[PDB]
């Protein structure tokens, strides 16, 4: 727990999350868990 959930956080904190949604957002949102 937390773990991977932060990756994530910093995901939803930095990336809008109308990404998971609609879409339209920046590449960066999708390497925001290179991990």
């Given at each position: 727990?937390?773990?991977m959930w932060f990756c994530?956080?910093?995901r939803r904190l930095l990336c809008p999350k109308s990404?998971?949604?609609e879409g339209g957002?920046?590449?960066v949102?999708?390497?925001m868990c290179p991990l």
């Open positions: 727990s937390d773990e994530e956080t910093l990404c998971s949604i957002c920046p590449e949102c999708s390497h």
